[PDB]
C-alpha cells in the first residue's frame, strides 16, 4: 500500500505553468467484466480506452483520441459488450449509435457499424445485459427501446414512459439491469422505483414503489444477488433486499446529496460520494453506519468506480482533473 | 438471580428512564460544559451478570430454538422483563416473521415469484480463454440465529429443525388471531424490527386492492381501522431515523376516512404521557431534537440542516412539529427557513402538518387583543406560513384548511379573513389600485400588451404564477365554494355597519373588507377563463333577485364576459343584450333604458383611445 | 399609512408600504413638508432617529426626469456613508425605471468613472459623493453642475469645520447656480458653527434640540458550565454575549464552533473593513451567535435579538441600560441575564433597583416559564 501517481497527459498539463483550465471534464466510466479494459471519457477532450497487461500503471500508454465520435457532438455513456471483447457501444448525443473496435497492434481505432432507429431525439443511456444478449437504449424524454446483439442489432419492442407512471413529465435519471438479466429497475425523478419485465423481447412493468421524495440518482446491485442499493438527492441510501422487496439497512449520514454509489465484487464495502467533496465507505452485512474511512476531496467534482475482478480503488479528484489508483488497500489504515 | 432480586432491578431501571424523561441531564459531553478555562478575572459488575448470565439468557435462548410456549407464559406474568435486553425483542420478531412469510408471498405473488428469478449472482469470467464460471460458496454452522455471508462462505443456524413446532397460517383470519398473542407482548416495540412493520402493512394494502370489487369494502376497511390503532401506529413512534418504513404505514392509511385518521393522530398525544413508558421516553427524545435544530437554523448552513430536519419530521412528526410550529407564530425569518425544508417531506408529514396547523388555529387564545385596535401578533405570522406552503410545495393538499375558512366565516371570524387575504396576494399576484399613478391608471384600461406592461410596473405578477393560482382555485371549485365566498364577504361587510366598537376602526375595517371582495373577484376572472366560469358563479338574473348585492357589484363580475360574446359574432351579439331580469335598485320608467344600460355595459376600454 | 399623510406623489407612496415604515419621527414631522415648498432647512436632531429619511423623500418629488443631466447633489463625510445613501435612494425608487443613482468616493480611478458618467446607460439624475472626490471631477470638464436644483449637505458641522474640507465644498457651490435649494442636516449643532453655516442659505427654517431582568448569584467557576446550560434551555432568536475583554472573547468562539454553535467575532483590535462585513452577515441572518466587547453597547438596532447575557457584569448603571436596550425593541419581549462573580457586583444592582425602580428578581431553581416571554 503506497501512493502511486497516474500517468496520463493530465499530470503534464498541471505540471506546466498553465493557468486557466488544464483538462476539462469527465462524462462516463465503464468497465468490461474481464477487468483489464477501461472507458475513460471526457467532455471536449478524449475518450481513452486502456489496456495495461501486467504492471500497476507504469507499463504503457495505449491510446488517446479526440476525434473518435466525430468533431461536433459528445458521448453520454460507453457500454461495453460482454460477449465480444473488441466491441464498445458508444452512443453520441444527437443521433449516433456507433460501434467501435480497438486494435492492439496499431495506434488506431476502427468502426464496425453505425446503426440508428429514426426519430431519435436524444439517447443518453445505453447498457448491455450482464450476459450480453440485449441492449436497452432509453431516452429521458419520450420512450425506451429494446434491441438484441446475438444475431445483430435489430429492434423488437418499445414502451412509452407515460404508461409506467402517471403524475407529470418525469425524467429518467438512472436505470439498472437486473443481475439475472430478466428485470429492469428504473429510477424516476419524483422518487418512483418501477420494475419492468424484460425476458426476451417483451417489455412490461410489474409494480412501482415510492422509495423517497427526490431524484433517485444511482441504482447498484449486489454480486451475491441478495439486495440492491439506491441513492438520492436527499441523504438517504437505503438497502432493499430482493426476496421480500423491503428495506434492511439505512445509511442515514445526511450531510449532503448523493451522487455516486459503488459496491465491491465481494459485496462488502459500499462507497458513497457526496456533493461536499466528501467520500465514505460502509458495510452491507454489518450494521447501519459503520464507516471504514472518510476522505476529504479537493475543490473539483470527483468520480468513484470499482474494478469487477479484484478490489482496487479508482477515484478522481486532483487539482483540476486526474484519477488516482490506490494499490493493495485491503486494510485502508 | 432470584425473583425478588430481579424485580428490584426492574424498578431501578424504570425510575432511571422516567428521571431522564421528565427533565434529566442533557449533553454533559459538550466542549463547553466539560472544559472550564478563564484567563483573567461496586454494583456495576453485579448488573453486568444479569444480562449475560442467568434467567434472561435462558429466556432468550429458548426463543432462538423454538420454545415459544414457556416464554409467552413468562412475559405475561412479568411484562417489565423487557426494557432490560434489546435482544429479547428481535427474537419475538424472527419467530413472527416465519409465520407470515408464506402469507406475504401469496398476496404479492407474481412480483416475488419472479424475484427468485431476480436473486441470481454474477458469474466470474476469465480474460485469457473467455471462460464462464459460477461462484463457489461454503456452508458452515454457527450458534447465531441470523444468517450471514462472509467473503467466501455462508453461516447458517445449526439447529435446522428449529421451526417444526411452529406452523404458518391462512389469509387474514389467523393473522388477526396470532397477533393478540405475539404482538401484545412486544406492544410498542416493533420499531426495533422495522422490516416486520412493512410486511404487515403491505398485506393490508394488498388486501383492500384484492377485495376492491364493489361489495366487501365497508367491513374490510373497518377491520384494519382497529389493527392500525391498536398495534401498528404506536409501534411507529418508537422509530428514530426511518423515512421509508413510515410511508408504508401511511400507504395503508390513505384508504381510511380523514375523520378517523385525526382520531388516531389525537390519541397519540394524550396517550403519550399518561400511558405506556418507552414511547414517552421517545416522544421526549424528539422534542429535544426538534428544538436543537431551530436554534442552529441559519441561512448558510441550510443546505445541510434542511435534509437533517426533514428526515426527523419524516419519522416522528407528532413530536417534531408542535415545537416547530410554536416558533413560527412567535418568530419570523425562520418561517422562510421552514418552508425551504418542506420540499423534502414525505406524504405522511403533509397530513400531520395540516393537522398541526388546524390544532393551532382553534386553540383557546384571545384572537383579538386587549383593546381591539390590533388583532394579535400570531394571527398575521401564521397566515404567511399557510400561504407560503401553498406557493412553494405542490404536494400538500390544503383542502381542510380551506374548509375551515368556509364554515367560520358564517360566524364572523378574524382569523379566516386574515388567512384568505394573504392567500390572494401571495399565490396570485393581485395588487390593490389605491396608490396608482394616473398615467398607469389609463394604461391599465387599454386592453393590450401595455396592460401587461402596466402590471409589470405596479408589481402585479399574474403571468408568472398562473399555474399556482389555478391550483388554488381548484380547491375552491371542488367544494363549490366560489359562489359562497362572494356572498359571505359581502354580507359580513354589510353586517359591520351596525357593530359599535370604535369610530376610526370601522372606517378602516369597512375599507379593508371592501378591497378583499374586489380582490377575490379579480382572481376568479383570471383562473376560470372560458366555459368554466358560468357553472361556478351565479347568473345575475338570480344574483340580483334571490340575493340582493347591489348594482355596481353585480355588473362588476359580468362585464368582461359579455364583452367577448359581443365581438364574437353578430348572431352572438343579439344574445347578451336581451339577457336581463328585474332590477331592484333602479327603475327603468323615467331613465331611458337604451342609455341607462349602456352606462354599466361599457368599460373604459372603448371610451378613450390614444 | 402615516406616510401617505405626507400628501406625496402616488408613485413615491407605493414603495413606502414595501419599505415597512408607518410612523413618522418628530424630526421628520417638522421639516419635510415645508421642504417640499422649496425653502431651505436647518436641522438639529439625535443620531439614528430618522435624519437620513428627511432628504430622500424630499428630493424624489421635486425632480423632473431629463435625459443626461444631474439634478440632486449630496455631499457627505466619508466613503462609507455615501454607499448607504445610494442603497436608500434606489429603494424608494424601485418602481421608477427612468431615474438612476451612482456613488463617488476615493480610491477609484476618476477616468474610469468618467466612462461611467459619459455612457448614458449609467448617467444618473442623482449623484452622491464625498466632496474630497466631487471636487476632483469638475476640474477636468467631466460633469456639469448647471442643471441642478437641489443641494444636500449632511453632517454640515463636521464637514465645514476642517479647513481642508472647507475648500472643496466652496468650489462646488460656486460651480452651481445660487437660485437653488440647499439642504443642511447634522447631528450636533453648537452655537459656534451656526454663524458660520448660514452663508449658503436664503431664509432658512431652524430646528434645534417590558424586559424581564434576572441575575444569577453564583461563585467564580460555575459560569463556563452555566453557559452551555443557559443556551440549551432557552428558545432564542439571536443571542449576544458581552465580554469585558478581548482575550476571553476569542477563546470562547473557538470553544463554541466546536460545540456546534457557529459564531462570529466583532469588536476593536481588528480591521474596520472586517468590522463592517462581519456585522453585516449578523444582520443577514448568516449566524445567530455573536460575542462582542463594550463597543456594541450603545445604539445598535437589530430587532432579532431577544437574549442578552452578561458574561462579565458592569460596574455602573449607565452602561447596563444600553446593553439590554437592544433586546425587546418596540414592545417586544426579551431577557437580561447577568453573571455575578465578584464583590463589587452586588453593589451595582443595589443601586439599580433604587434608581430605575426595576426589581431584578432572583433566578428560580426550576427555570422560567416558556409562556411568559413568548405568549405574555
From Swiss-Prot, chain A:
GO terms for biological process: mRNA export from nucleus; transcription elongation by RNA polymerase II. This is Protein TEX1. The lineage of its organism: Eukaryota, Fungi, Dikarya, Ascomycota, Saccharomycotina. Keywords: Nucleus, Repeat, Transcription, Transcription regulation, WD repeat. One of its GO terms (cellular component) is transcription export complex. Component of the TREX complex, which operates in coupling transcription elongation to mRNA export. The chain holds residues 41 to 373 of 422 of the full protein. Belongs to the THOC3 family. One of its GO terms (molecular function) is mRNA binding. It is found in: Nucleus. WD repeats lie at residues 21-60, 118-157, 167-206, 211-250, 253-292. Component of the transcription/export (TREX) complex and the THO complex.
UniProtKB/Swiss-Prot annotation, chain B:
It is found in: Nucleus. It comes from the Eukaryota. Present with 521 molecules/cell in log phase SD medium. Belongs to the THOC2 family. Component the THO subcomplex of the TREX complex, which operates in coupling transcription elongation to mRNA export. The THO complex is recruited to transcribed genes and moves along the gene with the elongating polymerase during transcription. THO is important for stabilizing nascent RNA in the RNA polymerase II elongation complex by preventing formation of DNA:RNA hybrids behind the elongating polymerase. Component of the THO complex, which is composed of HPR1, MFT1, THO2 and THP2. Together with SUB2, TEX1 and YRA1, THO forms the transcription/export (TREX) complex. THO associates with DNA and RNA in vitro. This is THO complex subunit 2. It comes from Saccharomyces cerevisiae (strain ATCC 204508 / S288c). The gene is THO2. The chain holds residues 321 to 959 of 1597 of the full protein.
Curated annotation (Swiss-Prot), chain C:
The modification Phosphothreonine is found at residue 108. SUPFAM superfamilies: P-loop containing nucleoside triphosphate hydrolases (SSF52540). InterPro entries: DEAD/DEAH_box_helicase_dom, Helicase_ATP-bd, Helicase_C-like, P-loop_NTPase, RNA_helicase_DEAD_Q_motif. This is ATP-dependent RNA helicase SUB2. It holds the Pfam family Helicase_C. Changing residue 113 to G: In SUB2-100; no growth at 37 degrees Celsius. A motif (DECD box) lies at residues 154-157. Residues 32-207 form the Helicase ATP-binding domain. Changing residue 112 to G: In SUB2-201; no growth at 37 degrees Celsius. Residues 210-371 form the Helicase C-terminal domain. Changing residue 22 to G: In SUB2-1; no growth at 16 and 37 degrees Celsius.
Amino acid at each position: 500500500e503506497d501512493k502511486r501517481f497516474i500517468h496520463v497527459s493530465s499530470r503534464s498539463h498541471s505540471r506546466f505553468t498553465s493557468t486557466p483550465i488544464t483538462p476539462n471534464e469527465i462524462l462516463s466510466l465503464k468497465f468490461h467484466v474481464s477487468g483489464s479494459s477501461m472507458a475513460y471519457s471526457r467532455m471536449d477532450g478524449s475518450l481513452t480506452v486502456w489496456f495495461i497487461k501486467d504492471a500497476s500503471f507504469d507499463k504503457s500508454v495505449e491510446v488517446y483520441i479526440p476525434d473518435c465520435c466525430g468533431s461536433d457532438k459528445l458521448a453520454t455513456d460507453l457500454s461495453w459488450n460482454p460477449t465480444s471483447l473488441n466491441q464498445i457501444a458508444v452512443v453520441s448525443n444527437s443521433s449516433e449509435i456507433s460501434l467501435l473496435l480497438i486494435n492492439e497492434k496499431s495506434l488506431t481505432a476502427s468502426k464496425l457499424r453505425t446503426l440508428s432507429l429514426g426519430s431519435k431525439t436524444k439517447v443518453n443511456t445505453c447498457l448491455y445485459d450482464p450476459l450480453g444478449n440485449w441492449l436497452l437504449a432509453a431516452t429521458k424524454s419520450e420512450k425506451i427501446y429494446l434491441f438484441d446483439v446475438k444475431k445483430d442489432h435489430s429492434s423488437v419492442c418499445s414502451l412509452n414512459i407515460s404508461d409506467i407512471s402517471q403524475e407529470d413529465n418525469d425524467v429518467v435519471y438512472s436505470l439498472a439491469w437486473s443481475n439475472g438479466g430478466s428485470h429492469i429497475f428504473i429510477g424516476f425523478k419524483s422518487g418512483y422505483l418501477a420494475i419492468l419485465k424484460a425476458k426476451h423481447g417483451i417489455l412490461e412493468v410489474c409494480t412501482k414503489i415510492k422509495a423517497h421524495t427526490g431524484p433517485i440518482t444511482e441504482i447498484k446491485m449486489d454480486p451475491w444477488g441478495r439486495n440492491f442499493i439506491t441513492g438520492s438527492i436527499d441523504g438517504n441510501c437505503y438497502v432493499w433486499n430482493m426476496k421480500s422487496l423491503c428495506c434492511e439497512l439505512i445509511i442515514n449520514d445526511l450531510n449532503s446529496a448523493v451522487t455516486t454509489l459503488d459496491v465491491c465484487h465481494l459485496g462488502k464495502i459500499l462507497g458513497i460520494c457526496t456533493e461536499d467533496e466528501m467520500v465514505y465507505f460502509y458495510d452491507l452485512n454489518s450494521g447501519n453506519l459503520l464507516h471504514s474511512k472518510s476522505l476529504a476531496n479537493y475543490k473539483t467534482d470527483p468520480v468513484l468506480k470499482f474494478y469487477p475482478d479484484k478490489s482496487w480503488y479508482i477515484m478522481s479528484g486532483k487539482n483540476d482533473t486526474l484519477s488516482n489508483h490506490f494499490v493493495k488497500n485491503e486494510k485502508n489504515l | 438471580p432470584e425473583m425478588e432480586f430481579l424485580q428490584e432491578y426492574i424498578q431501578n431501571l424504570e425510575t432511571e428512564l422516567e428521571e431522564e424523561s421528565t427533565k434529566g441531564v442533557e449533553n454533559p459531553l459538550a466542549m463547553a460544559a466539560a472544559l472550564s478555562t478563564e484567563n483573567e478575572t461496586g454494583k456495576q459488575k453485579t448488573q453486568q451478570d444479569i444480562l449475560l448470565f442467568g434467567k434472561i439468557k435462558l429466556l432468550e435462548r429458548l426463543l432462538i430454538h423454538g420454545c415459544v410456549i414457556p416464554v409467552i407464559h413468562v412475559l405475561k406474568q412479568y411484562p417489565k422483563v423487557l426494557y432490560v435486553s434489546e435482544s429479547l425483542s428481535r427474537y419475538l420478531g424472527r419467530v413472527f416473521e416465519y409465520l407470515l412469510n408464506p402469507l406475504y408471498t401469496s398476496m404479492t405473488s407474481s412480483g416475488e415469484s419472479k424475484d427468485m428469478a431476480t436473486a441470481l449472482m454474477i458469474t466470474r469470467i476469465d480474460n485469457g480463454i473467455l471462460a464462464h464460471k459460477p461462484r463457489l460458496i461454503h456452508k458452515y454452522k454457527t450458534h447465531e440465529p441470523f444468517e450471514s455471508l462472509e467473503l467466501n462462505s455462508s453461516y447458517v443456524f445449526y439447529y435446522s429443525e428449529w421451526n417444526s413446532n411452529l406452523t404458518p397460517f391462512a389469509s387474514v383470519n389467523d393473522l388477526f388471531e396470532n397477533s393478540h398473542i405475539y404482538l401484545s407482548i412486544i406492544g410498542p416495540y416493533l420499531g426495533r424490527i422495522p422490516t416486520l412493520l412493512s410486511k404487515i402493512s403491505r398485506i393490508g394494502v394488498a388486501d383492500i386492492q384484492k377485495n376492491h370489487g364493489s361489495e366487501s369494502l365497508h367491513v374490510t376497511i373497518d377491520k384494519w381501522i382497529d389493527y392500525v390503532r391498536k398495534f401498528i401506529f404506536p409501534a411507529t413512534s418508537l422509530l428514530q431515523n426511518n423515512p421509508i418504513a413510515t410511508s408504508e404505514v401511511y400507504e395503508l392509511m390513505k384508504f381510511f376516512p380523514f375523520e378517523k385518521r385525526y382520531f388516531i393522530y389525537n390519541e397519540m398525544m394524550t396517550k403519550l404521557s399518561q400511558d405506556i413508558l418507552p414511547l414517552k421516553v421517545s416522544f421526549n427524545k424528539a422534542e429535544r431534537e426538534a428544538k436543537s435544530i431551530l436554534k442552529a437554523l441559519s441561512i448558510d448552513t441550510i443546505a445541510k440542516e434542511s435534509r437533517r430536519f426533514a428526515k426527523l419530521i419524516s419519522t416522528n412528526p407528532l413530536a417534531s412539529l408542535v415545537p416547530a410550529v410554536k416558533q413560527i407564530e412567535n418568530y419570523d425569518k425562520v418561517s422562510e427557513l421552514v418552508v425551504y425544508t418542506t420540499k423534502y417531506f414525505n406524504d405522511f408529514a403533509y397530513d400531520v402538518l395540516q393537522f398541526v396547523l388546524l390544532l393551532r388555529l382553534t386553540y383557546n387564545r384571545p384572537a383579538v387583543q386587549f383593546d381591539g385596535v390590533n388583532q394579535a401578533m400570531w394571527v398575521q405570522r401564521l397566515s404567511i406560513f399557510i400561504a407560503g406552503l401553498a406557493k412553494n410545495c405542490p404536494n400538500m393538499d390544503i383542502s381542510n384548511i380551506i374548509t375551515y375558512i368556509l364554515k367560520t366565516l358564517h360566524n364572523g371570524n378574524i382569523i379566516a379573513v386574515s388567512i384568505l387575504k394573504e392567500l390572494i396576494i401571495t399565490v396570485g399576484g393581485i395588487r390593490d389600485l389605491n396608490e396608482v399613478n394616473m398615467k398607469q391608471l389609463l394604461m391599465l384600461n387599454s386592453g393590450s400588451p401595455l396592460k401587461q406592461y402596466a402590471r409589470h410596473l405596479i408589481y402585479d405578477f399574474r403571468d408568472d404564477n398562473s399555474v399556482i393560482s389555478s391550483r388554488l382555485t381548484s380547491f375552491f371549485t371542488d367544494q363549490s365554494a366560489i359562489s359562497e365566498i362572494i356572498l359571505l364577504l359581502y354580507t359580513l361587510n354589510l353586517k359591520a355597519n351596525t357593530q359599535n366598537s370604535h369610530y376610526k376602526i370601522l372606517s378602516t375595517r369597512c375599507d379593508e373588507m371592501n378591497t378583499l371582495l374586489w380582490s377575490f373577484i379579480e382572481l376568479i376572472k383570471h383562473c376560470l377563463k372560458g366555459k368554466a366560469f358560468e357553472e361556478n358563479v351565479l347568473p345575475f338574473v338570480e344574483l340580483n333577485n334571490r340575493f340582493h348585492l347591489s348594482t355596481p357589484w353585480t355588473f362588476h363580475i359580468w362585464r368582461d364576459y359579455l364583452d367577448n360574446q359581443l365581438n364574437s359574432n353578430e348572431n352572438f351579439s343579439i344574445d347578451e343584450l336581451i339577457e336581463g331580469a328585474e332590477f331592484s335598485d333602479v327603475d327603468l320608467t323615467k331613465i331611458s333604458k337604451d342609455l341607462f344600460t349602456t352606462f354599466w355595459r361599457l368599460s373604459l376600454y372603448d371610451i378613450h383611445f390614444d | 399609512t402615516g406616510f401617505k399623510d405626507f400628501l406625496l406623489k402616488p408613485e413615491l407612496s407605493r414603495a413606502i408600504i414595501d419599505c415597512g415604515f408607518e410612523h413618522p419621527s418628530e424630526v421628520q414631522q417638522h421639516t419635510i413638508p415645508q421642504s417640499i415648498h422649496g425653502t431651505d432647512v436647518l436641522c438639529q436632531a439625535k443620531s439614528g432617529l430618522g435624519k437620513t429619511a428627511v432628504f430622500v423623500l424630499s428630493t424624489l418629488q421635486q425632480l423632473d426626469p431629463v435625459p443626461g443631466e444631474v439634478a440632486v447633489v449630496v455631499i457627505c463625510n466619508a466613503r462609507e456613508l455615501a454607499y448607504q445613501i445610494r442603497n436608500e435612494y434606489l429603494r424608494f425608487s424601485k418602481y421608477m425605471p427612468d431615474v438612476k443613482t451612482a456613488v463617488f468616493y476615493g480610491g477609484t480611478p476618476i477616468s474610469k468613472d468618467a466612462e461611467l458618467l459619459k455612457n448614458k446607460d449609467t448617467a444618473p439624475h442623482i449623484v452622491v459623493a464625498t466632496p474630497g472626490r466631487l471636487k476632483a471631477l469638475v476640474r477636468e470638464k467631466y460633469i456639469d453642475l448647471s442643471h441642478v436644483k437641489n443641494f444636500v449637505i449632511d453632517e454640515c458641522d463636521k464637514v465645514l469645520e476642517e479647513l481642508d474640507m472647507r475648500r472643496d465644498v466652496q468650489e462646488i457651490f460656486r460651480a452651481t447656480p445660487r437660485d437653488k435649494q440647499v439642504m443642511m442636516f447634522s447631528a450636533t449643532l453648537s452655537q459656534e458653527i451656526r454663524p458660520i453655516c448660514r452663508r449658503f442659505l436664503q431664509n432658512p427654517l431652524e430646528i434645534f434640540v417590558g424586559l424581564q431582568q434576572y441575575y444569577i448569584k453564583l461563585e467564580e467557576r460555575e459560569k463556563n458550565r452555566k453557559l452551555a446550560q443557559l443556551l440549551d434551555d432557552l428558545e432564542f432568536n439571536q443571542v449576544i454575549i458581552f465580554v469585558k475583554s478581548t482575550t476571553r472573547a476569542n477563546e470562547l468562539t473557538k470553544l463554541l464552533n466546536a460545540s456546534n454553535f457557529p459564531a462570529i467575532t466583532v469588536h476593536g483590535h481588528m480591521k474596520q473593513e472586517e468590522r463592517i462585513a462581519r456585522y453585516k452577515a449578523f444582520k443577514d441572518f448568516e449566524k445567530r451567535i455573536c460575542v462582542s466587547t463594550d463597543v456594541f453597547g450603545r445604539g445598535i438596532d437589530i430587532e432579532r435579538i431577544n437574549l442578552a447575557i452578561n458574561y462579565d457584569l458592569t460596574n455602573e448603571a449607565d452602561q447596563y441600560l444600553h446593553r439590554v436596550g437592544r433586546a425587546g425593541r418596540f414592545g417586544t419581549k426579551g431577557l437580561a441575564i447577568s453573571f455575578v462573580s465578584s464583590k463589587e457586583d452586588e453593589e451595582v444592582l443595589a443601586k439599580i433597583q433604587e434608581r430605575f425602580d426595576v426589581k431584578i428578581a432572583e433566578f428560580p431553581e426550576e427555570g422560567i416559564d416558556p409562556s411568559t416571554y413568548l405568549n405574555n
